[PDB]
Amino acid sequence: PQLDHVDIDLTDKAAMQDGARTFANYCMGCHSAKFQRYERVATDLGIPADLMMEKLVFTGAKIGDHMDIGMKPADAKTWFGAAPPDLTLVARVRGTDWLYSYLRSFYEDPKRPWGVNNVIFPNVGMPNVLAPLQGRQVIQLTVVPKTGELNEAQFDEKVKNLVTFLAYSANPNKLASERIGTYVLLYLAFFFVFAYLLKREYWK
Amino acid sequence: AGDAAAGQAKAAVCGACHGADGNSPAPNFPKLAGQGERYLLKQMHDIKDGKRTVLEMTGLLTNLSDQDLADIAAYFASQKMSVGMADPNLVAQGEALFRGGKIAEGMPACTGCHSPSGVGIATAGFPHLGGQHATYVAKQLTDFREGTRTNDGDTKIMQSIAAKLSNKDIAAISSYIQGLH
């Protein structure tokens, strides 16, 4: 299907914090982020450890624990017909554009077990868990007026922030990677000139 | 789909127990205001066909057709569930269970199927919980745990989930749900 492009900014600490809030409240009910730790999410998002424990750790886990959830994959697969996959790496499995289009493409389809279908992910087993925010979206997708807390722009920002946090979760080393890579490449360019000159000197 | 306007007239008899607007005054009677239309209709049909046993409702839905039940459900769904108060001595434990479930015991958090605010998922049939009477929520969780209520389907979603809740857990989570909004 055709995806909607979203410009994800991994330096936006506020956007990633809002996305982490949305993930902890609306997504960790069924999805784990078990491959990342609350402590590292707090450190990378600029969230104080006490604030992270108070506001984003609902499972009773420690700050250094993986973002595990009570819903076991087997039970969830039985209940929903499909296991809610761990979302730590979903931004790498699907990409941020796919996630952005998917979380905004839920519409009402009574023939489906959960009364919804998805344009990006047809016959998906996800219930439309963000319906309170987006509102009632029906098929071209249109939101029924006065059915959600947020308008189209406000919901897009919410999904964008959530996808941004998912983008960070999949690749928590991206910012540190680009910083280190710049110096490694600078050194190698510096080393290349000496190696190139040394080769040129000898091959006379 | 049902018609809320006609449902209001059709739902007057129910208001004796559940309140005129679906916000029941008595804790033992569930609030129907703001409940998901799909869930309300499913519960009505389950009570009609005996899939769910409500002795106080014996014979009240037999004469109501599918369209009448749909109208009543639509009327109640158009309302807004009132919000009670959580017990201060129980709100912490109930909130912890509702938002985080149990990692060790494998019990899911309730915020997934029921929204983090307890509004449920209307399209999926997941009932609205926030603001429901603590006594009724405790009774429903106890029935699910004991197998008394089995109309949650073959997957036994709520039976399985409530199997992992203790009596103290049920009490605390019911109080939190009553205070939740």
């Binding site: 506001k55 | 108060m85 959580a86 017990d87 929204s115 939740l180």
Partner: peptide, 16 residues
């Protein structure tokens, strides 16, 4: 700022 940004969605009414 961050505390408001991270406020949990679920709000609970408590006696007193």
């Amino acid at each position: 700022a961050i505390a408001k940004r991270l406020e949990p969605v679920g709000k609970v009414c408590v006696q007193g």
